Design a protein around this ligand. Sequence first.
Ligand SMILES: Cc1c([C@H](O)C2[C@H](O)CCC[C@H]2O)ccc2c1c(=O)n(Cc1ccco1)c(=O)n2C
Ligand SMILES: Cc1c([C@H](O)C2[C@H](O)CCC[C@H]2O)ccc2c1c(=O)n(Cc1ccco1)c(=O)n2C
Ligand SMILES: [Co+2]
Ligand SMILES: [Co+2]
Lengths: 380, 380
Amino acid sequence: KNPKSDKFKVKRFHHIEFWCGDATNVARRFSWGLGMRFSAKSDLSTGNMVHASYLLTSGDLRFLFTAPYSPSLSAGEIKPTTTASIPSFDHGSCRSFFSSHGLGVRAVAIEVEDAESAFSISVANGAIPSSPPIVLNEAVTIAEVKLYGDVVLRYVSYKAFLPGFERVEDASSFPLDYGIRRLDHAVGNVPELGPALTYVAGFTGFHQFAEFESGLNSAVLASNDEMVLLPINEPVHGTKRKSQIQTYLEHNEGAGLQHLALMSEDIFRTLREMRKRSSIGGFDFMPSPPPTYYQNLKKRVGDVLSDDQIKECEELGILVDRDDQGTLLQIFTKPLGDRPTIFIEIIQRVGCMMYQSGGCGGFGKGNFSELFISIEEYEK
Amino acid sequence: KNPKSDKFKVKRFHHIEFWCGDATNVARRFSWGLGMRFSAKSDLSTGNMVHASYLLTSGDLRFLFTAPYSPSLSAGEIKPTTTASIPSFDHGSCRSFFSSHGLGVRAVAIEVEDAESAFSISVANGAIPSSPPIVLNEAVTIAEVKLYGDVVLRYVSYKAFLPGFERVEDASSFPLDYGIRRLDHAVGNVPELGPALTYVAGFTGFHQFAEFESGLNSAVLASNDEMVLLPINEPVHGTKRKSQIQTYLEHNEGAGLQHLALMSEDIFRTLREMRKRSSIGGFDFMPSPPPTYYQNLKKRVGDVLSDDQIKECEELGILVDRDDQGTLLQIFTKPLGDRPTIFIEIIQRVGCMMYQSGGCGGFGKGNFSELFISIEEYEK
Ligand SMILES: Cc1c([C@H](O)C2[C@H](O)CCC[C@H]2O)ccc2c1c(=O)n(Cc1ccco1)c(=O)n2C
Ligand SMILES: Cc1c([C@H](O)C2[C@H](O)CCC[C@H]2O)ccc2c1c(=O)n(Cc1ccco1)c(=O)n2C
Ligand SMILES: [Co+2]
Ligand SMILES: [Co+2]
């Protein structure tokens, strides 16, 4: 059931912005690790004395890495004379963010029809304003409201990347590509799911995306065409294995973004290319499941991909779940940084053709039960 | 003239420690970029709740990358119960360091016979104590005194990497190597060279290493066998091209480490391997000199390396200078991070054989005049 109750017109995910202490080093590690191209910059070379910002791109996926310069570089400026290309940026907010959380996502940015309307309707419906709408170079409008923890939902709208960014020179832009094409979903961990759901659903009009005892309870908010998907988790206390959600909240100093799920047009090529570079600057993957997993996946997805492909899934350590309209392939990286907080998910969806509809396959919650069962089978 | 006046027995450079906000991402960028192996760790996986520390190695070169966890992880601990493997570490000092300077070197660590004596004699001779000597696991003694800015000279001594670090598992350690073998010199920028020289020379007994109007004035302190080399720069104000030293001090918020010079056993292989990876996660190099440089280098170093090698120097953009005992090959990277502060120098020294004596060739100051002259020649 999709009551299509969006309070403003939303399009798709536009970019994800990381706040860090050195944008250069994070951007180059991510670029090599995920096979994303260096496509735009805003920094000293472009006259920005406030923040260094570098954009990586793969397909429609846009990763933005920003860090503050010394405030002394811009001490004579005021907000009307700023040289920041992103007007919401704040030295104190960014330093406080990185030192409280470590490396992580500051903004989940969705493109909308009208960022001023989106901000107005949002706050009129309970959103906590973060940065009021500002029109950049008569071309682009940008506005921010609080999402959870210190993460903001960022609205961007185009009358026709951002003003004041520069296209990178082709000799500095190497066309890496491991198959990743767009952001599928972005997931937050909070201490209490109920109030978090109520707040966000309340100011966007996003509806609960339907689904179908380890870790969490979760629920997925979705826009009208279910292309913008925002799952949210809370811990399940009092178990025997400590919830990784509660571990997240302890090491992250509170609520925040847990994982980004990136869609690949060919998860086999992606995971081969990423695994090649794991121990030479790229990303580590979570430990593979026992072969009993792949010894049971013929009995569940054997109509969807051949035994040659299921064997190919066994080498790369890929998980496979299934809804009632589609099948989901997925795997999880180790944490992107020092703390056991944010990680990335690689996914590919098969089914639900009309274009592919959003969320085809679900999000893999079944893989929890399948994993534990596959563990016990292997053990004995 | 070498009066060999060291006030305590010094051996060689032991490691360089970077303070950052995320150790993981800097370490992986440096590892791929410079061809250094991941060899030791101290972090949550090893029971350290205070700081994450990862060591990269290439030959005798040891790069340490450290960042703080949330203080909340270790709030119950006191200095006697600490789980930090490096006792000098301090959350507040490290956060304040990264937010004031951005990415940079916190410690230049030299190995000594007796770190307690080294610290005692040092402070008795004007050194500002930074961290008193502490004996780690009855095996290693560690002590710190201020060097310049927020950089400390770190003494380490072994009765027989550090206690509480772990050897990395071979499946996580990929044996990268681009030829780099040891740290040659570490260079500081200060606002006033005179007082800086007087202070450091005063508490170490290091002597002025002999040399032989753009940029700087500099002077090199050296230990008895001139293997530990600490050059220091100050700006030359009132020119026409702004001193890069003064630019350093403005963007770094004061004095600090300017460049690390890394010796390669084969600078041609090193620079080929590093240049291959420049735009896929590695390091950028400063713009090459005009071919007029290489058109004049036959007339100055033509007795040292063939015209085939001088042509090989032209492709890689390598500089060549010459003292009266040796010849120096060198090239400079772009800044390692967001700010125009720290950069790395790759060098190889030929001559002064007895083993090779320290500083063989000098440090390339002549390449300043040669560069400007080679510019003007090309232009007309
Ligand atoms: C993050 C995740 C997901 C979903 O993506 C996520 C949805 O997006 C949104 C709501 C549900 C929520 O779970 C699904 C399966 C997972 C994991 C996951 O992190 N791990 C690793 C792990 C090891 C020990 C503890 O967790 C897994 O094993 N499985 C199977
Ligand atoms: C750092 C450096 C050195 C020495 O290593 C250093 C010694 O270690 C210790 C004392 C002297 C001191 O200069 C030598 C030659 C250099 C550079 C250097 O940074 N650049 C780049 C640049 C472009 C514009 C402004 O600077 C150069 O061109 N040349 C030729
Ligand atoms: Co997911
Ligand atoms: Co040098």
